[PDB]
A paper describes a structure:
Proteins that perform these functions include Vipp1/IM30 in photosynthetic plastids, PspA in bacteria, and ESCRT-III in eukaryotes. Here, using a combination of evolutionary and structural analyses, we show that these protein families are homologous and share a common ancient evolutionary origin that likely predates the last universal common ancestor. This homology is evident in cryo-electron microscopy structures of Vipp1 rings from the cyanobacterium Nostoc punctiforme presented over a range of symmetries. Rings have an inner lumen that is able to bind and deform membranes.
Reconstructions were also generated for the other six symmetries and complete ring models built. Rungs are maximally constricted at the top and bottom with internal lumen diameters of 14 nm and 15.7 nm, and widest at the ring equator between rungs 3 and 4 with an internal diameter of 17.5 nm. This unique asymmetric curvature is a feature of all Vipp1C11–C17 ring symmetries. The analysis of different ring symmetries, ranging from C11–C17, provides us with a view of the structural flexibility that enables Vipp1, PspA, and ESCRT-III family members to perform their functions. Furthermore, as each ring comprises between 5–7 rungs stacked together to build a dome-shaped architecture, these asymmetric structures provide us with a glimpse of the structural features that enable filament tilt in the context of an ESCRT-III-like polymer. Based on the Vipp1C11–C17 models, where helix α5C is positioned at the tip of the spike, α6 helices likely coat the ring outside surface and do not contribute directly to polymer formation. Consistent with this, Interfaces 1 and 3 linking the top two rungs were poorly resolved in Vipp1C11–C17 rings, indicating a weak interaction once the limiting geometry is reached. When membrane was modeled into the Vipp1C11–C17 structures as a 4-nm bilayer, sequential constriction was observed with the membrane lumen reaching ∼3 nm within Vipp1C11.
Numbering used by the authors:
A (entry chain AC): 1 to 155
B (entry chain F): 105 to 155
């Protein structure tokens, strides 16, 4: 039984020792903040990448629209030509492209909504760091009062 | 001419496939972006502990 019992005593001592070594208010906040700052930068980069990706999709979408217009002209030409097969092929091409374009547009709209949310989240994250700084400023003010007491001793 | 027409049809299909592939990577990126948003929430919880 004691082996299990021994671990509990050891665990409590170990846990207490570990927390004390790393129990610094400034260090803990800074490490988290640095990670957050890096994440924010990454998020901004991702948003920029997403915008670039969205732009690429738009260019592809634009090309598809142009292709459809070209296909429409060909379809009109086919009617003038009087060949049933040529006209039928053009119609089929237009339909798949239109469906693809619609899907792309829906995806783009979703992507646009998503990037905006990310931007809003980034702004919220930016606001959060400022709030943390304000809290730190209050702590700094408290430190000055402690320093003043030390100054009195010097006198 | 028949071979060329077939080749022309084939290259167009490949181009369409490439466009689809390009679209697929964007979708994957969007999924990754959603995951990134989740990570920020986890970071916020850590920030509260720091306070």
């Amino acid at each position: 039984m004691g082996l299990f019992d021994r671990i509990k005593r050891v665990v409590s001592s170990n846990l207490n020792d570990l927390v004390n070594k790393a129990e610094d208010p400034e260090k803990m906040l800074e490490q988290a903040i640095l990670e957050m700052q890096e994440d924010l930068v990454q998020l901004r980069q991702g948003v920029a990448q997403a915008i670039a990706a969205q732009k690429r999709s738009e260019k592809q979408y634009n090309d598809a629209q142009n292709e459809i217009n070209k296909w429409q002209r060909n379809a009109q030409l086919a009617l003038q030509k009087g060949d049933e097969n040529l006209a039928r092929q053009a119609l089929e091409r237009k339909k798949t492209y239109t469906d693809t374009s619609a899907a792309l547009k829906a995806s783009l709209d979703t992507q646009s909504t998503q990037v905006e949310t990310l931007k809003r989240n980034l702004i919220q994250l930016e606001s959060k760091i400022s709030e943390a700084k304000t809290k730190k400023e209050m702590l700094k003010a408290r430190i000055t009062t402690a320093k003043a007491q030390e100054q009195l001793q010097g006198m």
